[PDB]
Structure prediction request, 1629 residues.
Amino acid sequence: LRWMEAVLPLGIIAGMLCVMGNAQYYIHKAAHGRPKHIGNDLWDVAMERRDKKLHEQAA
Amino acid sequence: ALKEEKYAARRSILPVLQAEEDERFVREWHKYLAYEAEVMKDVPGWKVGESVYNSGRWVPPASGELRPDIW
Amino acid sequence: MLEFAPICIYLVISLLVSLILLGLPFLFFDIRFYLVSILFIIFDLEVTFFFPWAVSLNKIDLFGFWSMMAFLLILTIGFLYEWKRGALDW
Amino acid sequence: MDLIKYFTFSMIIFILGIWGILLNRRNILIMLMSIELMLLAVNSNFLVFSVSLDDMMGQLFALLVLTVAAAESAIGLAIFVITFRVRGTIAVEFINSIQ
Amino acid sequence: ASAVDASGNPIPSSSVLMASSKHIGIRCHSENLDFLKCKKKDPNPEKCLDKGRDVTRCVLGLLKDLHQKCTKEMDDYVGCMYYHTNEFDLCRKEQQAFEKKCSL
Amino acid sequence: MNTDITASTKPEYPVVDRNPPFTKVVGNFSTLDYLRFVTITGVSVTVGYLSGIKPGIRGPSMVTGGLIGVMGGFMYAYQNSAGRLMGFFPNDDEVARHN
Amino acid sequence: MEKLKMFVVQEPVVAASCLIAGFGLFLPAVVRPILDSYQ
Amino acid sequence: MILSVLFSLALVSGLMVVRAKNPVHSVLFFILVFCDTSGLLLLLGLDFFAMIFLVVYIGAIAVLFLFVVMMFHIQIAEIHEEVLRYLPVSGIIGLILWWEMFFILDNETIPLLPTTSLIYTVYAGKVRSWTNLETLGNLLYTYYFVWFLVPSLILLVAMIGAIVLTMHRTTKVKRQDVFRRNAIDFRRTIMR
Amino acid sequence: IAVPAEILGIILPLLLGVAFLVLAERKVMAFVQRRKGPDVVGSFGLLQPLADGLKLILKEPISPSSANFFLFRMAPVATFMLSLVAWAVVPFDYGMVLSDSNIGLLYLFAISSLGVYGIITAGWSSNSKYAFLGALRSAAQMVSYEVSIGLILITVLICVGSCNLSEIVMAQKQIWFGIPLFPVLVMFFISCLAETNRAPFDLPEAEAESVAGYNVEYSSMGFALFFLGEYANMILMSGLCTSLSLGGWLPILDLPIFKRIPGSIWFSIKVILFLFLYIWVRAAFPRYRYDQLMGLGWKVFLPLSLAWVVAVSGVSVTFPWLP
Amino acid sequence: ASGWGITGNKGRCYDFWMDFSECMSRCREPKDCGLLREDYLECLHHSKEFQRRNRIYKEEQRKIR
Amino acid sequence: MFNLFLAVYPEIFIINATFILLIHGVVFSTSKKYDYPPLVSNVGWLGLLSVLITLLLLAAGAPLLTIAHLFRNNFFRRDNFTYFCQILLLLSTAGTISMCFDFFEQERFDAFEFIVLILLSTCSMLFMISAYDLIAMYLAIELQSLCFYVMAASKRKSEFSTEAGLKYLILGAFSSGILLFGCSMIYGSTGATHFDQLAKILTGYELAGARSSGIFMGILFIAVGSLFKITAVPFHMWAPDIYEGSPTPVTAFLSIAPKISIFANILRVFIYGSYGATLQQIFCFCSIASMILGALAAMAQTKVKRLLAYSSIGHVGYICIGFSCGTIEGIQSLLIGIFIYALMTIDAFAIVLALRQTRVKYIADLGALAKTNPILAITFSITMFSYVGIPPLAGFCSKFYLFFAALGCGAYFLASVGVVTSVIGCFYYIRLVKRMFFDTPRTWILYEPMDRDKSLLLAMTSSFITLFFLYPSPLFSVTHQMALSLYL
Prediction:
């Protein structure tokens, strides 16, 4: 268990990485209403703008 | 194979999006032509949306901004 | 683009936090370096040429692959010149 | 407007390199730096012209100009190092032995 | 992610279209090809808007028919194609459920 | 990658083939082409030996001259054979062989 | 052969790099045409 | 507006390069103007060219200049001249070049006066968007290989010149050798 | 808006991770050396980084008055900026990126290239010439091993068609690239060890030895900022190693029991193993002389990296194995 | 102008350039292709279109005044 | 070797030979087994052999250089004009290599990298002569520029060599920047880089007008860069200082080889592509300045190398009158003048290297040479009279045919200025001849004999110069054919 006590500070680094990643993810999700897309391009941007305009016109 | 699937799905959707964009651009260009006519009717020797090019070959209007599609 | 605005805001926030960290206590010759730099320039140009080649291997054919290999062979002879002359030693 | 602004900036950088060469009489490293500024202005002009004209030749030749400028900077700093070692100083009045 | 207007009308959108891509390309490959041919012949939008109108009619009719055929499966598919930005690999169960109802 | 073999100037002799393969061109080597290769290689080896005496590396100098001469003579022989086989040169013998 | 073994002993890393580069050039020079002919 | 700020910073950094008393400060402001040019490239849309400007100009050439300048240890009054005397000639030449820029702009490139709603989006080339890096690689390695192989010769010439100019091996200095017997096999020995 | 919130949520946990990383380095090195690290400042020494930071803050600063005050002060600021903006792009899972740049690899390479300027200016702005010489040595070493690192990046870019880390990982989905390229991963690990001046190739930290370093003149917060930049770079390059040769946020064998783990946990675990390897190598090996490490970088890793680039390109081009 | 576009597709008016080049190759007199050269330059710089838009804007502004 | 590369066998062979020579020289000069031998002579002999072999390849493969016309059209186009230009360039390079052998052994200059750079620069000039685009042009120009930087600064400890290298460095970088700005302006205002596209866009419309102001500026800046490359008086200030400071083989190569390549490049970029009266006016002004100031400055010089540099500047001014007429006879006269000037410069620099054994520096040093070395005195006097333009010798042929092209040119002002300059600039050649023959100095500088490598070349060049008036039909016909083949 001594090895566990020595690795315990490393677990804090892993937790910090998880916290930064997940906090970023959920703030972006709340800001936009959908998880961030990593494969987006000009086509995806145009489609998302068209979707926004169509939905705001329908509503 | 996955990327080809995505691109094939994109291609089948393209004609309807192009039709919608074409209709939108036609409406906007007709509005612009009407605006130009109503603001330029006073001067003589002015045409309505005359093309500065020759031999047809319609081209989209110049935007004046470098790479407007990326933004 | 549209993705480098977060990078700019990140840079600004990094400046802010670095300045805050600095201000917290206030509240209370040799030719070897030149040769190394020249080699750095040459191999930065090498890697800069590798990047598009590596990305576009699928489009460029054996023609492109062998053109890159010839480029390397032309520049690897320079590396052999470096090795034998003694530029890599210190 | 964007093309006008980019071309004006590139021309201003070219003129600024010219001014650096003009003002730096007893300074030679800054003369080389002004030459490098001229090179940067040329690269920026080529890139913006490629973007405006929708042609890839500007990008190709800008990359090649970058490579050439890096090589010529390497050679030039070699000349600077050997000169400074030979005469012990970078002052211009020590580099006027030929007339 | 709604995929439906107030009075049952199908919103074109992009998630709905991307979900119905295969159905569109199978039903009316024909006038899609015709519209692409007209666009190649003349890039001016005004010269042939009729082909685009026919393509739009096909797409709208297919969307209405698919929505009225299966609703829960199509609604789930469009919702999961809106949550993930038209990423087919992240929506497999919903896509498979959609496939079973409206066969290609 | 698309490649076009068309030359600006039209051949003045009948063309056996426009783009002969490397193996076919090598196999077309007549006794004259072999004499070309042998003469060039021998000239290069002799020059290397005669020039490497003063530095003191006669074997290495002959080896370097031999590689240079082999490359040059093979290039010259291949050039002559290809020019004959594409009709750029007086290829009477292989035109007769083709006929 | 003896000189080659001595060189490999004295400078193993450059010999390994040369062998790796030779393999990398040898695959498309020979095996690629072989596979093209086989197809 | 961001474009105006960027090239205002670039112009100020270039002026500091021109009129900087310390060559180290000149190198640093050269780095700054390179960074501003990279930002301009981001605005243009050439991400690859901006990154390679950073890597080469900011990294390689600028560390070279910094190394040589710091290693020189140039003192003031060794490189020092009054700038007031050359102000008239600098102004005249700059004004001539600016007037020529004026004439060039007045004829070919006419600025547009106020647009967004009139943008016609093709949607045809966006199905597979080729990046700048991808397009440049495809072209440069398929159909312009000669203009790519020639700079290899230029780099080889640069390396050969750098060596033949700034090489000085130590005439009499011992060099450590690791291939000794005690390092290789090391048979144990004793006094007996 | 939400972008500053995301940036703060990336930056502050990074600083906490750096503090606990130096604490973990102490603990692991002590446990290696048959002793126990910080255990008296809080339970198991968890409050030791807090105590150290508070002491550094409360320590009264000193002004060297080196006639280069601005450049002396701003160099650690520059390296801290560089480390943070490098961390601005590294992904943690599917969609946890600030800037999903299509050129993410070259962005990180450029940021690593800019990293030498902080140390160079720190060495020059200092009055002592020993610090200037040490800064020059460290800069040159980082230069050589960054050339090697760029060649390794080119190998990975040959393996994966794209240039963004997220799609790199999505390609890593199959084989993790470490199984095919374990020697390349080893060379990249040694190159990043020499890039951050950690483990062997440790010139600046050999202060008890004659080489001294570029941090001798620096005051409390300058030294603290340089240390934070170095350790943030260490974590950054561990993340680069796991994103390049271990698949990032990807489980092992794609079993459904392994998919219950979010994936950010997987990335964190891999980064932790790489940091443990960092401390392991530092504690277990001696250090190289400057000339030895420079010759090793310019004569051992550069030819091997070029050969591996050529070999991977030849393997991929010959067979249909190309993306 | 080469047809290699900035986004990997056909150039903006490489078609105009090729029309001008074919006219020059098959023409009896170089002034016959003056219109096509004007078209190519106008595409390159948008000078005539920008001037037309500028004069329209001038008339609109002076009508407001 | 796939069949497209028939178009590039000379360049490929010279590149591979340069690589082989570099590897051999390094591996057997860094060798402790021997006594670190000076490999400059061996590498130079092998490089001369390689130059001869690639000359044979290029000469025999006359129709094969046109293979893959469209494939190579992007980079370069080869025809009879480029064929003859490259033949002359290879001959000049071979002569320069052969005549600089004795400099190596006696002056201890034992860096084979000099020969490696000779070969690499020769390949660069080959690429330049073949070049048919705004990109290959710049790449070849920069390749020879870096080679010449290293060449001028070759003597590391020499203060003169270092200063000349630094000056040539800075001024060449400035000219490269100006030429690059010109290329950028042309690309931005034209959309084209290939010479054919530039010709198609530019023909039918003058460059002096409101339209194509950017095109005009780009063309003017490219002309400025090219004029710097040929040392015209508005941009000549580098030529004398670097010609003096750089080692004598380096300055001989600089004076002989780059002239033909740069002038062929100028013909292919300006006479074909941007042919318009404004360019000929620019080169007319440059030629007037070149002749006038070359004569005036060479009258005041007292050093052999500086006098040779100013004579080169004046003869470049004459080549510039030939260009600035820009007709069929004008281009033929340009080529005749280039050939004759290259031959005369090879002669003069061979004699200078012969006198380099005793370290000749001033004009007075060769005084009383008519007694110690009679035949050498007559040979050098013949060379000086050829530079003057005295009829029986080769220089007068180029001279009067340039003046005839100028009289059919309509440029009476240009011809009168040229002839007045020819009369004015005879004085320093006559002063040289006086120093050899007429003076009786108190003390004499005895000169050691020659090497056979320089002696054979000098004998052949002097025989060609003296006996050219008996048979100029081959050169005249070749130059006429080249001028005609520039377009059709």
